[PDB]
Swiss-Prot record, chain A:
GO terms for cellular component: membrane; viral envelope; virion membrane. Envelope protein required for virus entry into host cell and for cell-cell fusion (syncytium formation). It comes from the Viruses. This is Envelope protein OPG155. One of its GO terms (biological process) is membrane fusion involved in viral entry into host cell. Its main location: virion.
Curated annotation (Swiss-Prot), chain B:
It comes from Monkeypox virus. One of its GO terms (cellular component) is virion membrane. It is a single-pass type III membrane protein. Keywords: Disulfide bond, Fusion of virus membrane with host membrane, Host endoplasmic reticulum, Host membrane, Late protein, Membrane, Signal-anchor, Transmembrane, Transmembrane helix, Viral penetration into host cytoplasm, Virion, Virus entry into host cell. The chain holds residues 54 to 187 of 189 of the full protein. It is found in: Virion membrane; Host endoplasmic reticulum membrane. This is MPXVgp092. Contains two intramolecular disulfide bonds. They are created by the viral disulfide bond formation pathway, a poxvirus-specific pathway that operates on the cytoplasmic side of the MV membranes. Residues 1-134 are virion surface. Part of a stable entry-fusion complex (EFC) which is at least composed of proteins OPG143, OPG147, OPG155, OPG86, OPG94, OPG107, OPG104, and OPG099. Formation of the viral membrane is necessary for the assembly of the complex. Belongs to the orthopoxvirus OPG107 family. Envelope protein part of the entry-fusion complex responsible for the virus membrane fusion with host cell membrane during virus entry. Also plays a role in cell-cell fusion (syncytium formation). One of its GO terms (biological process) is symbiont entry into host cell.
Length: 94, 134
């Protein structure tokens, strides 16, 4: 079956479904992109990481599935500032 | 002297013609089945992310030919978003992304796929055209 490998697809090589990024509702505060590595983050004040919040599902999907490796990641489960509620929200959504 | 050059070359060119006639007749059958299936359904002509078990495909029916067509991946076959479990929300969302952003590149089962890729997708399980005709 003809496969144009010039076009990149992360799903080709990721065997662990929890390693895949997916968009979920963050109740109260919009949408977020999540995986086992944590949430996709933006540089929040003090040059730290805050969870990236999207107003719409489509902005989340577009941002997640766009082109770049989405380097900035905030993980609440292993950070020295562990957020146990935001970590439980993470593993509930995976 | 090699003994049946002309008569074998003619059987081969007629073989290629018979391949193309079988493809066209299958295309026609599937097109008419498409017309009969499409009846009474909305968004049959709109791309939808369809779960084939091991992967998602963004597909629809053509408005003209009525054949199944899918979002194409580069210069190859339909874009098959590989799943890593029975439930893979990430693969599903990526397929939705393909619908919103990559839908100008489309490939149609049958004659067009034969022209573009050298096979029709029909009569070749587990290819997605065959699964649809099943």
């Amino acid at each position: 079956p003809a496969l144009d490998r010039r076009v990149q697809d992360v799903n080709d090589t990721i065997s662990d479904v929890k390693q895949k990024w997916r968009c979920v509702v963050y109740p109260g505060n919009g949408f977020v992109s999540a995986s086992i590595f944590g949430f996709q983050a933006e540089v929040g004040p003090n040059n730290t990481r805050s969870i990236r919040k999207f107003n719409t599902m489509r902005q989340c999907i577009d941002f997640t599935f766009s082109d770049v490796i989405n380097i900035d990641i905030y993980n609440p489960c292993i950070a020295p500032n562990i957020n146990n509620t935001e970590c439980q929200f993470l593993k509930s959504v995976l | 002297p090699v003994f049946n050059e002309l008569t074998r070359y003619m059987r081969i060119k007629n073989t290629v013609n018979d391949w193309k006639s079988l493809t066209d007749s299958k295309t026609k059958l599937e097109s008419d089945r498409g017309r009969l299936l499409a009846a009474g359904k909305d968004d049959i002509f709109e791309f939808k992310c369809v779960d084939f078990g091991a992967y998602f495909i963004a597909m629809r029916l053509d408005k003209k030919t009525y054949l199944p067509q899918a979002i194409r991946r580069g210069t190859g076959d339909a874009w098959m978003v590989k799943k890593a479990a029975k439930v893979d929300p990430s693969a599903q969302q990526f397929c939705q992304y393909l619908i919103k952003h990559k839908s100008n590149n489309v490939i149609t089962c049958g004659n067009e796929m034969l022209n573009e890729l050298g096979y029709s997708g029909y009569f070749m399980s587990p290819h997605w055209c065959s699964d649809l005709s099943n």
